[PDB]
Design a binder for this molecule. Structure first.
Ligand SMILES: [Mg+2]
Lengths: 256, 255, 63, 63, 85, 165, 63
RNA sequence: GUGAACCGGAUUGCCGUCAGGAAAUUAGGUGCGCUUAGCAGUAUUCCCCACGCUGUGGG
């Protein structure tokens, strides 16, 4: 009995009109915060039922929520799509009661229920950031000449491939390697979005700071096969990759 | 010790005191012409009044045949330049004739002013001519406050119903008798963002902000409508919003 | 009043009457010592009635 | 026992009261000019009001 | 900071601040009468408070009485402003 | 005075379409039309930030609308009661002159939010007599200083001494 | 933008400015008094009829 | 207590009553915003917690 709905964003029309939704999607933390507030704590509704106070996340409750940023249902209208799921009841009249300019159509929600079998075909779209934890030589200053010390910095490098390998079967081999651990097996998958995803974060007289959030996103699509139905119920609403809370874990439950 | 009462009272257009030619009484201060209410006018208005009538009280407050009454009032000097005006009246014949008009067809005089009114009581001599009746003296001082808060000069009022109330009363218990008329050596110029009474009370506040630099003060405005000193500075000892609690605080200070 | 009413037929009726019963006369004209300026919201009768109500509350909570 | 009537009345552009030169009566109140209606004019209008024919009982004449 | 760079009427990312009263001003300001506002709604607030006779106490975005027309105002700043200093 | 001369210079540097959108905004406030408020922000907010002696909001808006309507050049020593007042010497003293004098007399009894219409008819009288120059800077710092009596006093007897020459 | 034909300097223009325009659906109203037209041409009725017809044609066919 | 003390200038009242600012009027003639561009075939991705350091609890 999972909670699947649709938020609908314009991303089009007259360029002269300032569209706050367009800058709302052009950052991770904005959509993250707005969908995180979309499950408010119950005592706030009893206290302020009108969404008319300076909020605080300590008053809010915390759940491993997750979304999906897509676009382009055609038919002579370019439009952008937000697909959200989590485990608690969301509210959309509470969330966007002052943000009617954010959307291009009123949101809609129905009841959806997923079922899985053994050795059954599926169709899926996932998004996982290309993340490989590596020891790197540090490279700072860069004032005319390179300067390094013996310290090896620890971070997650974006995925790279050898010069005799195209990106396509490299990410196919990544998905093939990650399949038997998570609980499925595929025969082929198609790469259709490899790119860079940028964002920024504020944090606590104090100031505010801007740092470029960095994620090597990978959105794929097409034809899934399963090995056991019991290895998929714990995958939905939790995520399979990294940047889990940032909207990188929705299992597209479309059996066809 | 001396109880000093400085009252700011804005009166609607009227003629409370008339000279020989019917003009409002006029004085000279700050190098400009001011509207004046004579001291004896306010004295007789406070006296002979059922608002105040409710050894002998009111003989000591205002004397009658070497009494040397404890309470005396100053001439009500306006805070601004006087603005006397001609009102033209006619009195109809109210009988159909071949002509029109029958009365005096004359002109009356009227003026509206914000008056500073000074009152001084000596406590010790007020007790002295009351034969030591301290409670009676406290009651008659409270009665003075009650009357002079809500009695106006009963001058020409049938045609000019001016029954305005004071918007500010400052009561102090200082050492020497000083009048704050020097506060209004400046006539009050009216600005768009402030009214006449607020500016007059502000001039009073800016003048009592001095003198102390080179005693106490109870300030009364109706429901704190006009605060003496638009800051948190120690300028008024007690900002009081109601007249009854002002009288109570003054009485419990005295006794 | 029957002034130039033939040329200025101004027979508007009052929007507010306060009839008070008391033993001392009160002039509420001191409410309008500060002149009433118009604003985008409300009208002049509403602003004047608000100023008069403010002064009535101040007088009742005062004298 | 005093009965007090405080009325707020908005009027159309009119000249209810005039002085010698045919100007509306003006008085200074609060340091600013205020349009004025004389009390004698109001008293005459009340005495010659349609709600006073059954009550009017006085003549002020020299004839 | 405590507003988390978020607007108060529409909860958009905030970039400026607005004053509720000018009892203290110039440099003397304490952070209990200031509202963190976004760019598109601070302009609407200033469009509304200029000639409403607001004197000292400006528009609060923290009461229901002053809010319902703020959205009606913010409807048309999007409508007519050239985005193109 | 700083903040006012640059305001007059920026108003004089405005182009024709900007003056047109100010002209259409005449007679009402700036809360009902966007581009009037955007233009007032553009011509006020940086000059308000840069100088402490910037003029008050409503008088600046009034002078902006009046300059858009009438468009007279800025010239020192050409204030209103000199130019009108020298105009008041060429009229018939018994009937016409008291009427124009009452038109100028009305200006002493308005607040700041209805003041533009009697000023508009006065500047129309000025335009009918081919007057190209007006002390815009002088007009705006005496208009922002309207809260006092001495300023109206020197205004008035400046009209008198312009009349008695 | 008015563009200079001769490239004797860098890629400037010449004169730059704003023109203003609008599009509208207009309601036009005309009233002709027949008897006043007859009186004004001193009774030439054919001239008045020709004037009315030509006015009707010119109001439609001329902008 | 100092030519001082005690000490109202009182009340009686509609300016009113007659009025079209009126007749006449093109704002016109002149005008290119325009020259540069993968939202992505990778070589540090800004990180807090953690694996024999390449899985793992997420800002
Ligand atoms: Mg907002």
């Amino acid at each position: 009995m999972i909670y699947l709905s649709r938020l609908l964003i314009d991303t089009g029309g007259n360029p002269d009109r300032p569209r706050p939704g367009r800058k709302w999607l052009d950052n991770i933390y904005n959509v993250h915060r707005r969908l995180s507030m979309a499950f408010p704590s119950g005592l706030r509704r009893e206290q302020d039922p009108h969404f008319l106070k300076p909020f605080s996340p300590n008053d809010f409750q915390k759940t491993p929520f997750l979304f999906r940023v897509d676009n382009n249902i055609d038919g002579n209208d370019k439009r952008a799509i937000i697909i959200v799921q989590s485990v608690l009841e969301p509210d959309w009249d509470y969330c966007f009661q002052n943000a009617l300019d954010f959307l291009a159509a009123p949101p809609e929600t129905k009841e959806y229920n997923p079922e899985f079998k053994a050795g059954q075909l599926l169709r899926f779209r996932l998004r996982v950031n290309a993340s490989v934890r590596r020891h790197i030589p540090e490279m700072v200053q860069q004032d005319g000449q390179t300067i390094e010390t013996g310290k090896i910095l620890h971070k997650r490098v974006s995925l790279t491939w050898d010069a005799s390998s195209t990106p396509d079967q490299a990410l196919a081999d990544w998905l093939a390697a990650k399949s038997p651990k998570l609980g499925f097996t595929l025969q082929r998958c198609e790469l259709l979005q490899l790119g860079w995803v940028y964002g920024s974060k504020p944090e606590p007289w104090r100031e505010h700071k801007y740092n470029p959030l960095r994620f090597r996103a990978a959105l794929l699509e097409g034809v899934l096969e399963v090995d056991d139905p019991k290895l998929f119920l714990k995958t939905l609403s939790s995520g399979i990759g990294k940047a889990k809370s940032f909207g990188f874990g929705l299992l597209s439950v479309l059996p066809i | 010790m001396l109880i000093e009462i400085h009252m700011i009272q804005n009166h609607s257009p009227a003629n409370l005191n008339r000279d020989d030619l019917g003009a409002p009484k006029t004085c000279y201060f700050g190098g400009v012409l001011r509207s004046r209410i004579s001291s004896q006018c306010i004295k007789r208005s406070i006296r002979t009044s059922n608002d105040f009538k409710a050894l002998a009280p009111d003989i000591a407050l205002c004397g009658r045949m070497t009494v040397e009454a404890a309470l005396q009032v100053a001439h009500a000097i306006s805070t601004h330049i006087a603005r006397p005006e001609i009102d033209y009246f006619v009195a109809a014949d109210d009988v159909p004739g071949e002509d029109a008009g029958a009365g005096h067809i004359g002109e009356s005089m009227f003026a509206s002013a914000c008056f500073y009114k000074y009152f001084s009581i000596d406590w010790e001599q007020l007790v002295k001519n009351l034969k030591g009746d301290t409670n009676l003296a406290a009651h008659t001082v409270g009665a003075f406050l009650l009357a002079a808060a809500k009695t106006n000069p009963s001058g020409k009022q049938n045609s000019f119903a001016a029954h305005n109330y004071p918007d500010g009363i400052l009561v102090e218990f200082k050492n020497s008798p000083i009048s704050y008329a020097n506060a209004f050596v400046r006539p009050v110029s009216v600005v768009k963002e402030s009214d006449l009474v607020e500016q007059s009370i502000g001039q009073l506040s800016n003048y009592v902000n001095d003198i102390r630099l080179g005693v106490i003060g109870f300030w009364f405005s109706p429901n704190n409508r006009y605060p003496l000193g638009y800051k948190h500075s120690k300028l008024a000892s007690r900002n009081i919003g109601n007249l009854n609690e002002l009288v109570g605080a003054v009485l419990d200070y005295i006794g | 009043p029957s002034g130039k009413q033939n040329s200025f037929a101004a027979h508007n009726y009052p929007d507010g009457i306060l009839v008070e019963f008391k033993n001392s006369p009160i002039s509420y004209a001191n409410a309008f010592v500060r002149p009433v300026s118009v604003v985008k919201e409300s009208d002049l009768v509403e602003q004047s009635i608000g100023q008069l109500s403010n002064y009535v509350n101040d007088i009742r909570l005062g004298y | 026992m005093l009965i007090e009537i405080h009325m707020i009345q908005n009027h159309s552009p009119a000249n209810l009261n005039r002085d010698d030169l045919g100007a509306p009566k003006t008085c200074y109140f609060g340091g600013v000019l205020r349009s004025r209606i004389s009390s004698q004019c109001i008293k005459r209008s009340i005495r010659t009001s349609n709600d006073f024919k059954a009550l009017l009982g006085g003549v002020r004449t020299r004839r | 900071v405590m507003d988390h760079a978020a607007c108060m009427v529409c909860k958009a990312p905030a970039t400026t601040v607005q004053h509720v009263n000018y009892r203290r001003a110039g440099g003397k300001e304490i952070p209990e009468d200031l509202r963190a506002l976004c760019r598109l709604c601070h302009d609407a607030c200033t469009m509304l408070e200029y000639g409403s006779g607001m004197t000292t106490n400006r528009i609060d975005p923290c009461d229901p009485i002053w809010r319902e027309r703020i959205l009606a105002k913010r409807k048309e700043i999007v409508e007519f402003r050239s985005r193109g200093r | 005075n700083r903040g006012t001369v640059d305001f007059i210079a920026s108003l004089e540097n405005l182009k024709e379409g900007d003056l047109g959108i100010l002209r259409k905004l005449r007679g009402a406030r700036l809360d009902e039309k966007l581009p009037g408020f955007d233009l007032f922000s553009a011509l006020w907010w940086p000059l308000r930030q840069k100088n402490q002696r910037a003029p008050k909001r409503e008088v600046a808006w009034l002078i902006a609308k009046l300059f858009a309507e009438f468009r007279f050049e800025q010239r020192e020593g050409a204030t209103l009661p000199i130019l009108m007042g020298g105009i008041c010497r060429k009229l018939e003293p018994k009937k016409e002159l008291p009427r124009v004098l009452a038109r100028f007399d009305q200006l002493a009894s308005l607040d700041i939010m209805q003041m533009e219409e009697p000023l508009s008819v006065i500047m129309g009288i000025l335009r009918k007599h081919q007057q190209v120059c007006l002390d815009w800077v002088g007009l705006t710092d005496v208009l922002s200083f309207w809260e006092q009596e001495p300023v109206k006093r020197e205004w008035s007897d400046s009209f008198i001494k312009a009349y008695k020459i």
